[PDB]
Amino acid sequence: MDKKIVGANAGKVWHALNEADGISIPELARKVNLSVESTALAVGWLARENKVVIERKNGLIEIYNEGHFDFSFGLEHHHHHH
Amino acid sequence: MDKKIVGANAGKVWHALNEADGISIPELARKVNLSVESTALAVGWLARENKVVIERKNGLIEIYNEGHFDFSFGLEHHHHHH
């Protein structure tokens, strides 16, 4: 059992992108409170359906939300990290 | 060309799994000349074809290959003979 785990935690990392996307793995990991390997791999489950799209600027890894194509809303006023 | 890039880099990280899998993401990253983020994201392109098995041992995440679970076969597509 693996696709149920990565299916569950992928919703939480994707939710933090709806706030503000173009964010790196360990920064995103502090808001969602997942391990760096767990956060990147949860985003990999989103990449399956292109719920995320990847850009590399200056060698850095950006994670974009699919919402900036169709519909996205930062109506939830910024989820602070831990 | 996000899927073109991650498709190339996933073939590189999976090639490393074909000869030595069940390895941690940063160790694998140093082998495939990529960063931890880039490697785990390329392993995410393997996860969308279930080519990797994600095993959290004492909290530590290891990624095995699909070659251990050889249940990727099935039954012939049954059709009428004519």
mmCIF file of C-alpha atoms in Angstrom:
data_model
loop_
_atom_site.group_PDB
_atom_site.id
_atom_site.type_symbol
_atom_site.label_atom_id
_atom_site.label_comp_id
_atom_site.label_asym_id
_atom_site.label_seq_id
_atom_site.Cartn_x
_atom_site.Cartn_y
_atom_site.Cartn_z
ATOM 1 C CA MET A 1 0.000 0.000 0.000
ATOM 2 C CA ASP A 2 1.698 3.218 -1.332
ATOM 3 C CA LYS A 3 -0.633 5.048 -3.858
ATOM 4 C CA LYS A 4 -3.156 5.741 -1.009
ATOM 5 C CA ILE A 5 -0.366 7.359 1.159
ATOM 6 C CA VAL A 6 1.115 9.489 -1.691
ATOM 7 C CA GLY A 7 -2.478 10.207 -2.868
ATOM 8 C CA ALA A 8 -3.351 11.670 0.593
ATOM 9 C CA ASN A 9 -0.215 13.874 1.247
ATOM 10 C CA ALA A 10 -0.202 15.180 -2.413
ATOM 11 C CA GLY A 11 -3.470 17.066 -1.654
ATOM 12 C CA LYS A 12 -1.818 18.978 1.254
ATOM 13 C CA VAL A 13 1.324 20.089 -0.747
ATOM 14 C CA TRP A 14 -0.923 21.062 -3.767
ATOM 15 C CA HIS A 15 -3.137 23.130 -1.359
ATOM 16 C CA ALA A 16 -0.051 25.187 -0.225
ATOM 17 C CA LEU A 17 0.649 25.957 -3.967
ATOM 18 C CA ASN A 18 -2.938 27.453 -4.338
ATOM 19 C CA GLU A 19 -1.771 30.050 -1.710
ATOM 20 C CA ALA A 20 1.447 30.886 -3.708
ATOM 21 C CA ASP A 21 3.344 28.605 -6.204
ATOM 22 C CA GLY A 22 6.891 28.723 -7.711
ATOM 23 C CA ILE A 23 8.247 27.480 -4.343
ATOM 24 C CA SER A 24 11.252 25.144 -3.537
ATOM 25 C CA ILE A 25 10.896 21.624 -1.880
ATOM 26 C CA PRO A 26 12.198 22.314 1.811
ATOM 27 C CA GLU A 27 10.307 25.694 2.092
ATOM 28 C CA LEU A 28 7.035 24.089 0.962
ATOM 29 C CA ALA A 29 7.877 21.148 3.345
ATOM 30 C CA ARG A 30 7.825 23.557 6.395
ATOM 31 C CA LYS A 31 4.209 24.754 5.647
ATOM 32 C CA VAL A 32 2.859 21.182 5.013
ATOM 33 C CA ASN A 33 5.148 19.692 7.787
ATOM 34 C CA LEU A 34 6.409 16.744 5.596
ATOM 35 C CA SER A 35 9.985 15.364 5.120
ATOM 36 C CA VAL A 36 11.968 16.775 2.063
ATOM 37 C CA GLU A 37 11.949 13.299 0.298
ATOM 38 C CA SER A 38 8.163 12.947 1.189
ATOM 39 C CA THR A 39 7.235 16.467 -0.138
ATOM 40 C CA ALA A 40 9.085 16.069 -3.509
ATOM 41 C CA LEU A 41 7.572 12.559 -4.003
ATOM 42 C CA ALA A 42 4.012 13.811 -3.025
ATOM 43 C CA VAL A 43 4.444 16.461 -5.792
ATOM 44 C CA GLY A 44 5.494 13.536 -8.117
ATOM 45 C CA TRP A 45 1.935 12.079 -7.655
ATOM 46 C CA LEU A 46 0.593 15.516 -8.812
ATOM 47 C CA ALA A 47 3.051 15.457 -11.832
ATOM 48 C CA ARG A 48 1.212 12.214 -12.882
ATOM 49 C CA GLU A 49 -1.898 14.326 -13.732
ATOM 50 C CA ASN A 50 0.064 17.630 -14.352
ATOM 51 C CA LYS A 51 -1.525 19.116 -11.174
ATOM 52 C CA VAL A 52 2.023 20.617 -10.982
ATOM 53 C CA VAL A 53 4.291 21.975 -13.809
ATOM 54 C CA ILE A 54 8.111 22.310 -13.299
ATOM 55 C CA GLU A 55 10.372 25.314 -14.200
ATOM 56 C CA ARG A 56 14.144 25.637 -13.470
ATOM 57 C CA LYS A 57 15.520 29.214 -13.008
ATOM 58 C CA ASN A 58 19.296 29.658 -12.165
ATOM 59 C CA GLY A 59 19.475 25.831 -11.568
ATOM 60 C CA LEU A 60 16.790 26.085 -8.772
ATOM 61 C CA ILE A 61 13.667 23.802 -8.762
ATOM 62 C CA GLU A 62 10.273 25.668 -8.923
ATOM 63 C CA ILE A 63 6.888 23.921 -8.392
ATOM 64 C CA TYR A 64 3.921 25.597 -10.139
ATOM 65 C CA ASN A 65 0.180 24.862 -9.532
ATOM 66 C CA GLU A 66 -2.093 23.842 -12.533
ATOM 67 C CA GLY A 67 -4.502 26.623 -11.400
ATOM 68 C CA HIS A 68 -2.516 29.465 -13.160
ATOM 69 C CA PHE A 69 -3.699 27.850 -16.500
ATOM 70 C CA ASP A 70 -7.488 27.600 -15.674
ATOM 71 C CA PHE A 71 -8.542 28.819 -12.135
ATOM 72 C CA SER A 72 -6.449 29.690 -8.994
ATOM 73 C CA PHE A 73 -7.370 31.727 -5.871
ATOM 74 C CA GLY A 74 -5.192 32.762 -2.864
ATOM 75 C CA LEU A 75 -8.473 33.555 -0.971
ATOM 76 C CA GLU A 76 -7.034 31.713 2.079
ATOM 77 C CA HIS A 77 -4.785 34.523 3.476
ATOM 78 C CA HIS A 78 -1.287 32.869 3.534
ATOM 79 C CA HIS A 79 -0.826 29.619 5.596
ATOM 80 C CA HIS A 80 2.218 30.353 7.875
ATOM 81 C CA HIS A 81 4.959 27.635 8.182
ATOM 82 C CA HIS A 82 6.270 25.552 11.153
ATOM 83 C CA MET B 1 8.910 21.336 -21.813
ATOM 84 C CA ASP B 2 8.598 20.106 -18.118
ATOM 85 C CA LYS B 3 7.616 16.438 -18.994
ATOM 86 C CA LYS B 4 10.432 16.248 -21.667
ATOM 87 C CA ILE B 5 13.087 17.361 -19.072
ATOM 88 C CA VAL B 6 11.842 15.125 -16.167
ATOM 89 C CA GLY B 7 11.391 12.242 -18.694
ATOM 90 C CA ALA B 8 15.136 12.434 -19.591
ATOM 91 C CA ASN B 9 16.319 12.821 -15.920
ATOM 92 C CA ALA B 10 13.979 9.945 -14.771
ATOM 93 C CA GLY B 11 15.653 7.563 -17.269
ATOM 94 C CA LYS B 12 19.026 8.498 -15.661
ATOM 95 C CA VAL B 13 17.890 7.953 -11.978
ATOM 96 C CA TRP B 14 15.974 4.695 -12.920
ATOM 97 C CA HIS B 15 19.125 3.397 -14.769
ATOM 98 C CA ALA B 16 20.913 3.769 -11.376
ATOM 99 C CA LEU B 17 17.996 1.765 -9.756
ATOM 100 C CA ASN B 18 18.348 -1.010 -12.432
ATOM 101 C CA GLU B 19 21.919 -1.760 -11.115
ATOM 102 C CA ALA B 20 21.511 -0.546 -7.427
ATOM 103 C CA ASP B 21 18.002 0.408 -6.047
ATOM 104 C CA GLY B 22 16.599 0.838 -2.484
ATOM 105 C CA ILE B 23 19.045 3.755 -2.084
ATOM 106 C CA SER B 24 18.370 7.158 -0.346
ATOM 107 C CA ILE B 25 17.557 10.188 -2.642
ATOM 108 C CA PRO B 26 20.784 12.369 -1.780
ATOM 109 C CA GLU B 27 23.138 9.331 -2.317
ATOM 110 C CA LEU B 28 21.411 8.542 -5.618
ATOM 111 C CA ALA B 29 21.574 12.329 -6.465
ATOM 112 C CA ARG B 30 25.399 12.363 -6.114
ATOM 113 C CA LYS B 31 25.517 9.258 -8.437
ATOM 114 C CA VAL B 32 23.223 10.779 -11.181
ATOM 115 C CA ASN B 33 25.031 14.236 -11.096
ATOM 116 C CA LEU B 34 21.698 15.930 -9.985
ATOM 117 C CA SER B 35 20.611 17.742 -6.734
ATOM 118 C CA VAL B 36 18.360 16.068 -4.025
ATOM 119 C CA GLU B 37 15.294 18.058 -5.295
ATOM 120 C CA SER B 38 15.974 17.294 -9.037
ATOM 121 C CA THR B 39 16.514 13.538 -8.303
ATOM 122 C CA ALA B 40 13.392 13.059 -6.044
ATOM 123 C CA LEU B 41 11.352 14.991 -8.697
ATOM 124 C CA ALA B 42 12.749 12.632 -11.458
ATOM 125 C CA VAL B 43 11.800 9.657 -9.160
ATOM 126 C CA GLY B 44 8.308 11.310 -9.096
ATOM 127 C CA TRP B 45 8.173 10.743 -12.926
ATOM 128 C CA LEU B 46 8.908 7.035 -12.131
ATOM 129 C CA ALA B 47 6.077 7.050 -9.458
ATOM 130 C CA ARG B 48 3.482 8.099 -12.151
ATOM 131 C CA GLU B 49 4.295 4.723 -13.908
ATOM 132 C CA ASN B 50 4.712 2.949 -10.441
ATOM 133 C CA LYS B 51 8.399 2.176 -11.446
ATOM 134 C CA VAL B 52 9.461 3.009 -7.792
ATOM 135 C CA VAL B 53 8.462 1.566 -4.351
ATOM 136 C CA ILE B 54 8.536 4.154 -1.474
ATOM 137 C CA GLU B 55 9.541 2.508 1.865
ATOM 138 C CA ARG B 56 9.738 4.603 5.094
ATOM 139 C CA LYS B 57 12.095 2.674 7.433
ATOM 140 C CA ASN B 58 12.575 4.430 10.856
ATOM 141 C CA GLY B 59 11.251 7.580 9.035
ATOM 142 C CA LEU B 60 13.993 7.258 6.299
ATOM 143 C CA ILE B 61 12.630 6.987 2.686
ATOM 144 C CA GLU B 62 14.196 4.395 0.273
ATOM 145 C CA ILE B 63 13.087 3.942 -3.407
ATOM 146 C CA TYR B 64 13.155 0.348 -4.838
ATOM 147 C CA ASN B 65 12.428 -0.561 -8.545
ATOM 148 C CA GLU B 66 9.296 -2.243 -10.111
ATOM 149 C CA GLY B 67 11.586 -5.277 -10.964
ATOM 150 C CA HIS B 68 10.915 -6.678 -7.421
ATOM 151 C CA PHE B 69 7.088 -6.678 -7.976
ATOM 152 C CA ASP B 70 6.788 -8.617 -11.305
ATOM 153 C CA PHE B 71 2.912 -8.480 -11.166
ATOM 154 C CA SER B 72 2.872 -5.979 -14.139
ATOM 155 C CA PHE B 73 1.529 -8.784 -16.457
ATOM 156 C CA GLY B 74 -2.192 -9.577 -17.028
ATOM 157 C CA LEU B 75 -4.660 -11.602 -19.148
ATOM 158 C CA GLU B 76 -5.091 -11.495 -22.988
ATOM 159 C CA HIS B 77 -7.805 -9.120 -24.363
ATOM 160 C CA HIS B 78 -10.637 -11.676 -24.922
ATOM 161 C CA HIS B 79 -12.343 -11.167 -28.352
ATOM 162 C CA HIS B 80 -14.604 -13.249 -30.704
ATOM 163 C CA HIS B 81 -12.656 -15.471 -33.224
ATOM 164 C CA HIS B 82 -13.546 -14.777 -36.929
#
